Amino acid sequence: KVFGRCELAAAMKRHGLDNYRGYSLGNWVCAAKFESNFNTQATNRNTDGSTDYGILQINSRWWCNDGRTPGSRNLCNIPCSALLSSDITASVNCAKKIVSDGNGMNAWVAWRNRCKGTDVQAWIRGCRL
Numbered sequence: 001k002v003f004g005r006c007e008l009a010a011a012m013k014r015h016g017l018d019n020y021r022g023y024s025l026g027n028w029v030c031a032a033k034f035e036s037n038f039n040t041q042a043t044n045r046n047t048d049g050s051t052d053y054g055i056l057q058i059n060s061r062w063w064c065n066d067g068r069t070p071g072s073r074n075l076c077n078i079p080c081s082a083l084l085s086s087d088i089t090a091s092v093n094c095a096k097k098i099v100s101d102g103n104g105m106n107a108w109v110a111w112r113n114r115c116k117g118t119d120v121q122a123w124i125r126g127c128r129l
């Protein structure tokens with residue numbers, strides 16, 4: 001599923017991401033924009049053999065099981081495929097674990113390089129929230 005901007009903002013809010021670990025909704029929407037362009041089915045293979053999955057490009061080295069990332073863990077206790085669903089529940093639940101891991105949203109390299117410190121409220125501007 002390719003979400004609209006305000007559609008995804010509303011779904012992220014429903015699932016409790018607005019201000020989660022202190023990160024306003026606009027941060028999460030911005031992260032999703034640059035990670036997946038709002039596409040739940042996005043995947044990206046990394047050089048280390050791991051793969052990133054879904055709207056927030058969550059990685060198989062620590063967070064999900066894809067059966068092909070040697071030495072990896074599955075801390076969200078899910079198949080990585082769950083992260084590609086039109087229903088963002090698994091991605092949101094797992095993101096909450098990631099952002100609590102100590103480095104905050106810096107865990108998303110695209111958030112750090114493209115969202116951090118910017119006017120992130122622009123990402124939710126106009127939306128019925």
Ligand SMILES: [Br-]
Nearest residue numbers: 001002003039
């Ligand atoms: Br779609």
Ligand SMILES: [Br-]
Nearest residue numbers: 004005033038
């Ligand atoms: Br957009």
Ligand SMILES: [Br-]
Nearest residue numbers: 004005006007
């Ligand atoms: Br929109």
Ligand SMILES: [Br-]
Nearest residue numbers: 010011012014
């Ligand atoms: Br919704």
Ligand SMILES: [Br-]
Nearest residue numbers: 014015016089
């Ligand atoms: Br919910």
Ligand SMILES: [Br-]
Nearest residue numbers: 024025026121
């Ligand atoms: Br915001």
Ligand SMILES: [Br-]
Nearest residue numbers: 067068069070
């Ligand atoms: Br594996």
Ligand SMILES: [Br-]
Nearest residue numbers: 069070071072
């Ligand atoms: Br293994």
Ligand SMILES: [Br-]
Nearest residue numbers: 072073074075
């Ligand atoms: Br594990």
Ligand SMILES: [Br-]
Nearest residue numbers: 065078079080
């Ligand atoms: Br599994």
Ligand SMILES: [Br-]
Nearest residue numbers: 011087088089
């Ligand atoms: Br949803």
Ligand SMILES: [Br-]
Nearest residue numbers: 015089092093
């Ligand atoms: Br959720």
Ligand SMILES: [Br-]
Nearest residue numbers: 078089090093
């Ligand atoms: Br879940």
Ligand SMILES: [Br-]
Nearest residue numbers: 021103104105
């Ligand atoms: Br933080």
Ligand code: NA
Nearest residue numbers: 060064072073
């Ligand atoms: Na894994």
Ligand SMILES: [Pt+2]
Nearest residue numbers: 014015016089
């Ligand atoms: Pt939820």
